[model samples]
Target chain A: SREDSVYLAKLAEQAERYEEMVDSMKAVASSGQELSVEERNLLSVAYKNVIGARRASWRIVSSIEQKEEAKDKSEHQVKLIRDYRSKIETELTKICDDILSVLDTHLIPSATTGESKVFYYKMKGDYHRYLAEFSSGEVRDKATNASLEAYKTASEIATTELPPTHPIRLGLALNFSVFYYEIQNSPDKACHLAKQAFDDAIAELDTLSEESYKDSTLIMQLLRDNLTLWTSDMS
Target chain B: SREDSVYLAKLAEQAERYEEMVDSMKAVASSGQELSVEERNLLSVAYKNVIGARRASWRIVSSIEQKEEAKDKSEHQVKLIRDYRSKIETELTKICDDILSVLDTHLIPSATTGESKVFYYKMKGDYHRYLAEFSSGEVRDKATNASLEAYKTASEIATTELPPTHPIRLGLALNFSVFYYEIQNSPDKACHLAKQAFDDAIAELDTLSEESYKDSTLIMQLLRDNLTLWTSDMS
Candidate 1:
C-alpha cells in the first residue's frame, strides 16, 4: 500500500488515534510548506486531543489536592497527592511546549496567507492560555503576555483579510477576549472585545456564507453570552 | 527489594501510575478476603483515576461533535465525529463495567465492616451514576434505578452504623441526592434529601470526630450549596 501523510493524518484523526494522527501530521508540517485550512484544523485537533486529557486530569487532581489537604488525612497521603499534582503539572507544561515548538519551528514560519497565519498565531496564543491556566509565579506571567501578544497579532491580521463572519476570525476574537477575561483578569477589555466581535458579525449577517453560517453564528452566541454574563457580574 | 501487593499497590497509587495501581490492587482483591477501609479506598481511587480522564475526554469530544456537526463543514467530518463519540461511549461503558465487576465480584462481598461495605456500595452507585450522565433510552433508565438501589442500601446502613458526622454517611447522602437531581430528573426529592442531610449533620455538629471534622463540614457545605442553588432556580 502507498503512504500519504495528509490522507493518513485525517484517517487517524477520524479514528480517534490522536497520537498516531500527530505522528502522521508531523511529517507534513515538517516539509516546510503552507498548510491548507483542513490540514491546519486537523493538526490543531490532533494536538488538542493529545493535550486536553492531561489538562482535564490536572484540573481534577488539583481539586482533589485541595479536598485532601483540607481533610489532612495523613502527612504521607498529602505529600503523595501534592507530588502527583507536580507530576501532572510537569506533563501539562511539557505537552504545551511540544505543540508550541511545532508552531514556532514549522507551521507559523511556513504559513503563506493571512488566514493561515492568523490561525497558527491564534493557536500559539491558545497553548499559552492553557499554560497560564495552571502555572504560577513568573512562568504564568510570561505565558499570559505571550498569549496576549499572539492574539493581538492574530486579530490585527484577521480584520484586514477575513470577514467578520469567517469562523476563523470570529473564533480568534472569541478566544482572544476569553484570554483577556480569564488570564489577564481584565473584564472590561474582554467585554469590549467580545461585544465588538458580536456587533461586527451581526452587522455582516447578511453576507454570511452558507458553509460557515452555523460556525459563525455559534461563535456570535458565545461572544454575546460572555457579554451578558460579564455585565451582570459587574453589579 | 522485596515486592508486596499492599505496599506495591499503595506505592503505585501515590506515584500517579494508575494503570499500575489497578493491576496491583487487582491482586489484593482477587485474594477474596475482607478488604480494610484503606484497601477499599485505594481500590476506588485507583479505578477513579483510570476512568476519570476518559470521562473528561468524552465530554470534550461530545462538545466538539456538536459544534462540528452544526457547522456542516463536510458531511464526512460530521460522520467521523459522531463515530468518535460512539467509540468514547464504548470505552466509558467498558471501564465502568470493569470497575463494577471488581466491586461485585470481590470488594462488596469481602467487606467485613459497615464502613467498608458502604464505601464499596457507594462506589458501585457512583459508576452507575456516571454511566447515566452520558447515556439515554433504556440504558440510562437501568443505570438510574441501579444507582438508586445501591445508594439506598448504602445510606440505610450508613445511618444505622455510622454517625451524622461520618464522612461516608454524609458523602452518600450528597451523591444519592445528586442522582435524583441529575439522572432521575426529580429536583424536589433531590433538594429534600440534601436538606435533610445538612440539617442532620448540623444538629450533631458537636459529635464531629476531630479526625473527620474537615471531611464532614466540607460535605455539609456541599449539601447546603445544592439546596440553595436548587431552591433559587425554582423561582
Candidate 2:
C-alpha cells in the first residue's frame, strides 16, 4: 500500500515533470529574441513526439493491471495470493511513469541547451540501468514479461533505444521464487529469489514511510528466514 | 470491461474444471479393474502430482488483479513500462493456469493408463510450440534483435526427458505466453495470438468437455467468438 501510494505520487510528479521540461525547452529556444517559425516547428515536434513514447509506457502499466496480475490464483482460495503480485506491479508502474514524466517535463526541458548527444546518452543510460533489474524481473516472472519482452525487442529492433524503469521487477523477482517454489519444489531457488528481492529493496531503500518500510522489510526478511529454515529441513 | 469480465469468468470455470477432472481421475483409478500395484502407484502419483499443480495454478490466477488498474492516463509515464507488461501477463497467466491445470489433475493421472503416450504426444507438441514462441519473444526483445538469435541458441541448450502431457508442459506454456505477450505492441499480434489460442482450444475439444460439458462448451464458444472477432476485424 505504501508502495502504491508512492507510485501514484510518482505518476503525478512525472507527468508534471514532462510538462515542465517542455516549457523549459521553449524558454531556451526563445532566449532574448523573437522565435523564428522554424524554431517553433522544431519545438512542436519534440513535444508531440514524446506523447507516443509516454503513452507506450502508460499503456504497459494500465493494461498489466487490466489483465495479468490477478490471473492465476482463484478468487475463493486462501488469502488471495495473486493480489500480492498486482499490488507490487501497481506500485512499479507508477514509479516508471513518474521517472519518465520527470525526464520529459523536468530534466529535458532545461537540458536542451546542453550537449544534446551527451545529455541524451547519459539520460538514456541512467533510465535504462535504473530500471534494468526491474525489467529483468518482469521478464523473469511477471505476466507482462511478454509485453516487456516485446517492448524491449521493439526498441532494439528500432535500434539505439534503451528501456526505462519498470515497477514489475520486484514482483517478477518474487514471482520467480513462487514459480520455483511451487513447481520445481526447489525451495533454495525460491529463497534465492526472495533474498534477491529483499536485498534489492535494501540497496534501493524503498521510498516508504518508517512504519510501512518496517512492515514490508519484516515480511521479506521473514520470508527468507522462514524459507531458509524450510529448505534446510526439506532438502 | 466486458472482455475482462468474460476472461475472468472463463478462468473461474477452468479452476472448477480442474477440480472436477481430478475427481474423475480418482474414480477411474479406484474402479475395480484388475491392475498391479505399480499401476495403482502410477495413478496415485498422477493424483498427488496434479493436486500440487492445481494449487500452483490457483495461486497464479488469484494474483492477477493488481491495485494500480484505476490510475489516470494523464499521468502516463514510467521508466520501463514493464509493470504494465506484468499486469497483462498476470491476466494471461490465469487463462494459462486454467488450461494447464487439467493436465496436472487429469491427464497425468491417466498417463500410466492406455492413453499415456497419446496424452504425452499431444501435450508435447503443444508445449514445445508454446516455448518456442515464448523464448523467441524473450531472447529477441531484450537488447537486440540478434539477442533473439542468441536466445534461440541458448534455448536449444535445454534438455528434458518428460514427454508431452507432463504437467510441467503447462508451466512451460504459461511461461511462453507470459513472454510472448509482454513485448508485443502490434494489434495484429494480438489478433494472431487470439486466433492461435482459438485453434488450439478447438484441437483440444474432446478434452475440454469431459468434466461438466457445459463449462467446456462455454470456454470453446468463448474462444470461437474471440477468434471470430479478431479475424473479422481484419475484414
Candidate 3:
C-alpha cells in the first residue's frame, strides 16, 4: 500500500538516509494522485536536507572569496579559487531550480489547506534566498527580487488564512524575518517583523490546539530569540 | 563510573552528535589512563565524521578549480573562485593539525594493544593524506612523505601483531590501498596491495574467531571490491 511506502520513506528520513527518502517519495509523486500534508513535509524535508550542506559550503566559499579579493595573492591562485566558487553556484542553482520545479508542478497547485500553501511558499522563498546567496550580476538581482516576492506572498496568505498561534504562520514569520535580515540586509525590518509575530503569537497562546501546542510555542520562542538578537544592535 | 561516560560518548557517536562525542572523549583522554581499543575507535570515528564533510567539499572544489583552469572564465571571476579554494584549504589544514594534536597528546602514546597501535598509526596516515589533498608546494610534499611513513609503519605493525583475518589489518589494507590509488596516483600499486590483502585474508578465513569474523569479512569484501575496480582499469 502507499501508506507502507510513505511510512518507509518517513523512516528513511529519521535515519538520515535522505537520498533514499527522496527516491521513494518521488515515485509516489509520479502516480498522479495528490499528496497528503504529511507527504508534502516528507518531500520538502528530503530535498532540503540534500540541499542544506551545499548552502553551508557556499557561505564559507563566498565569504572567503570576497575577503581574498581585498587581500592580494598570486594571480594564478585567485583564478583557481574564483572558478571553484562558480562551480558551487552552478550546483546550488540546479538543486534550487529542481526543488522549485517540484513545488510549482505538484505541491503548490495541489495544496488544499492554508498550512500547505504557506509551507510551499515559504520553501519557495527559502530556495530563492539560497540562489541569491552565491549568485552575482544579473543572477543575483533576479534571485533577490524573486525571494522578496515569494516571502511577501507567503506572508499575505499566512496572515489571512492561518491563526497567529499556528506553527506554520510563526514558521513563515521566522523565515521571512530571516530573509529580510540576511538576504535583504535590512535589520530594522527584520526586527519589526519578528517582534510582531512574537507578540501576536504570545497573545493567542491559550488558543493553540493541544496537538500543535509544542510546535507553535517552539517557533514562538524562536521568533522571540531572533527578535532579541536582531534588535540588540539596531535599537 | 567511567563506563557510563564511555557508554554515553558512544551513544553520541550513534546519534551523529560528533562534536559532543569529541568533547566528552577529550575529557576522558585527559584523565591519564590509557584508552581501551573501544575508546580509541570511538575517538577516531568521532573525529572522522566531523572531518568527513569538509573532505568531500574539498574534492568538489579542487576538481572544479582544475577544470576551470582548462576552461575560460572572466579574470575577476576566476580570481574569486581561486581565493575561496585557498580559504577552504586553510580550514582543512587547521582541523587536520587539530586531530593530529589529539593523537599525539593522548591517544597514541599510552596505547597498550597491537590493535590500538595499528589504529593510531593508520589514523596518523589518514590525517596526513587529508592535509596533502588541497595543499601544494612544500606543504603538499611534506604531507605526502609523512603519510607514506605513517602507513608503512602501520602496515609493519599490522603484519606482525594482527592476524590476516583481523578486521583492523584488513581495514588498514583497504585504506593503504586507497592512499596509493588516490593520493599517490599509483594505480598498479593500489591494485597489488588490495589483491594481496584479499588473498591473504581468504586463506585465513577459517581461522577467524566468531567475535570479529563479520568485521574482518566485511573489510575483506571491500578489499576485493577495490582490487577489482583498480585492476579493471589497469588491465
Candidate 4:
C-alpha cells in the first residue's frame, strides 16, 4: 500500500512535467495492478496535457506561417505541421477512446453519486468534442452528435442533481449554449440556454465572499455577453 | 582540434533543442574554452530561440486573459507573466552584453573587411534595440541613441560591403528606415531610406523564381505599406 501511494505521488509529479510523463503514466495504467481512482485521474490528466500542448504547438507553427516571409522554410514547416497534427490527433483519439471505455464499463457503473456522474459526462463531452475536430464524414457526424448528447445529458443531470445556482451546472449551461450557438446553429436554443446560465450565475454571485465576488463579476459579465450575442442573433 | 570540433558539434545539436540548450550554451560560454566563430554564433542563436519562445509563451498567456472569464486566474497569470518578463529580460541583457564585449574589443578591431564590420554593428544595434524596450527615462534614451548609432554604422558599412540590390543591404535599409521613422521621428530621412529599401527589394523581386516571387509579394507589400505611411506623414 505504501509503495502504491509513493508511486501515485511520483505520477503526480511526472504529470506536471508533461511530455516525459505521457509514457510513464501509460506504463502505470498498463501494469496489471489495479489502479486507484487517483491513478485513473492522473492518466486522464496526462493525456489532456499532451493534447493541449500539441494544439498549442500547432497554433505556434501556424502563427509562423502567418508572419514569416521565408518561402522555403515556411512551406517545409507547414508540411511538417500537417504531419504532426495528424499523428497527434490519432494519438489523442486512441487515448480518449480508452478513457471512454473505462467510463462506460467501470467508472459509470460504480458511480452512484451525482457528482461523479456529472464529472463523467463532462469529460465524455470533452473527448467527443476533440474527436469531432479531426474526424471526417460519417465519423465526424457521429462525434459531433455524441458530443452534443454528452453535454445535454450533463446539463440535464446537473439541473436535478445539483442546485440550479451550482457552479458546475452554470459551467455546463454556458458551454452547452456555446455549442448550440456555434456548432449547431440554433440561435433560439442558444438564447434559451444562455438565459438560464446567466440567471444561475447571478444567483450564485451574491453568495460569494468578498474576494470571490470580485472575481465572479467577470463571470457574470461573460454570461451577460453570451446572452446579448444570442439575443441579437434571434432578433 | 578534433576534440574542439566534436564539442562544437554537440553544442550545435543542443542549440537545436532550444530551452535545454540555453543553460548548456551558457555553461560552454562560461567554461573559458576558446570558442570558434561557429560556437559563438550558436550561443547567439540559442539565446534568440529562448527569447522567441518566451515571447510566444507571453502571447499564449495573454490570450487566456482575454478569453477566460476567471478574473482571479487572469490576475495571477498576469503577475506570473510580469515575473517571467523581468527574468527573461535580465538573462537577455547579460547575453547581449557578452556579445557586445566581444564586438567592442575583438571582432570590430580584427575586421579587415567591411562585411565583418557590418555584422558587428548589426548585432550591436539589435542588442541596444532590445534594451530600449525595458530601459526607461534617461537609460531608455541612451539605449535608443546607441541603437540608432549602431544601425547607422551598419548601414554605412553595408553600402560599400554590399551592392545596393543585395538582400542583406535591403534588410538593413528597411530596418534602419523603421528606426528613423519610429524612434528618431525623422520622417524625411525615414522616407529616403525606405525608398531605397523598397527599390532594392523590388529589384531583387524580379530575379527570384516564380514561387519565391509569390512569397516575396507579401514582403514587397509590407515595404509599400511603410512607404505609404511615412509619405502620408510627410505630406
Best-fitting candidate, measured by DockQ? 1
Task: Let me know the TM-score candidate 3 reaches against the reference structure.
Answer: 0.53
Question: B172, model 3: CA deviation in Å?
Answer: 1.0
lDDT tens readout by residue for model 2, A139-219:
434423332442333333222321111122333344445545653466777787677666756764566667656655655
User: Candidate 3 regions off by >4 Å?
Assistant: A1-235, B1-5, B67-71
- Candidates by DockQ, descending order: 1, 4, 3, 2
Candidate 2's residue-wise lDDT over B142-175, tens digit each?
Answer: 3223323322322232213332222332223332
- Interface RMSD for candidate number 1? 7.7
- For model 1, residues A66-114, the per-residue Cα lDDT tens digits are 7777876566666665776787788879878988998999988988899
Best candidate, lDDT? 1
lDDT of 1 at B185: 84
Better of 3 and 4 by lDDT: 3
TM-score of 2: 0.21
The per-prediction tally of clashing pairs is: 0, 61, 11, 0
Could you tell me every candidate's TM-score relative to the true structure? 0.57, 0.21, 0.53, 0.44
Q: Given the true complex, what DockQ would model 2 score?
A: 0.01
Cα RMSD to the true fold for all candidates: 10.1, 23.5, 19.0, 13.2
lDDT of 4 by residue, B1-235 (tens): 3334334334334324454344555555554354455655665676677665544543444454355435655565455445444554566567667656766766666666565567667767877766675667897799899999999899888987765555445656666777778777888888888786777667666677777566556555666789998788777
Candidate 3, B1-235: lDDT as tens digits: 5665676566455445566677767677766688877887777787787678567655665665666677776554445446656756776788788878877887778778888889888998999999887778998999989999989999999999988888888988899899999899999888889888888989988876786778888898898888878777877
Which of 2 and 3 is the better model by lDDT? 3
Better of 2 and 3 by DockQ: 3
- RMSD in Å for candidate 3, one decimal? 19.0
